[PDB]
Amino acid sequence: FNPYTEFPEFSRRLLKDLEKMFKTYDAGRDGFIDLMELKLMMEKLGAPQTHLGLKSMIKEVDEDFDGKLSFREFLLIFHKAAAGELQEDSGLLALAKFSEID
Ligand SMILES: [Ca+2]
Ligand SMILES: [Ca+2]
Ligand SMILES: [Zn+2]
């Protein structure tokens, strides 16, 4: 996985910022953000989600079908947001907008 060829529209600064955010919320430090971690991220960001809402969020970008978020799938969230691909009511969009990244 190469984030520079995969997401060429992301500056180096933005990549690091997102790496910083991913690491912040991977509380267990296993390299993934799972439903429990994502629950705590949405609470902290001011956009708390229901348990099925959080499952729906992950599902949207869970390209390896494992229930949790790899870094690349995390980045994919922000790609979609910046490309106009998230619905206006998506918790993923609340994630991107309330990250105060950018
Ligand atoms: Ca984790
Ligand atoms: Ca996954
Ligand atoms: Zn469940």
Residue numbers in the entry: 79 to 180
Task: Give verbatim lines from the article.
EFhd1 and EFhd2 are homologous EF-hand proteins with similar structures. Although separately localized within cells, both are actin-binding proteins that modulate F-actin rearrangement through Ca2+-independent actin-binding and Ca2+-dependent actin-bundling activity. In addition, we determined that EFhd1 and EFhd2 bind actin independently of Ca2+ or Zn2+ and also exhibit Ca2+-dependent and Zn2+-dependent actin-bundling activity.
In the case of EFhd1Ca, CaCl2 was added to the protein solution directly to a final concentration of 4 mM. In the case of EFhd1Ca, the peak heights in the anomalous difference map were 3.4 and 2.7σ for EF-hand 1 (EF1) and EF-hand 2 (EF2), respectively. EFhd1Zn had peak heights of 23.0 and 14.0σ in the anomalous difference maps for EF1 and EF2, respectively. This suggests the metal coordinated in EFhd1Ca was Ca2+ while that coordinated in EFhd1Zn was Zn2+ [Table 3, Figs. Considering both the anomalous signals and the metal coordination geometry, we deemed the metal at the interface to be Zn2+.
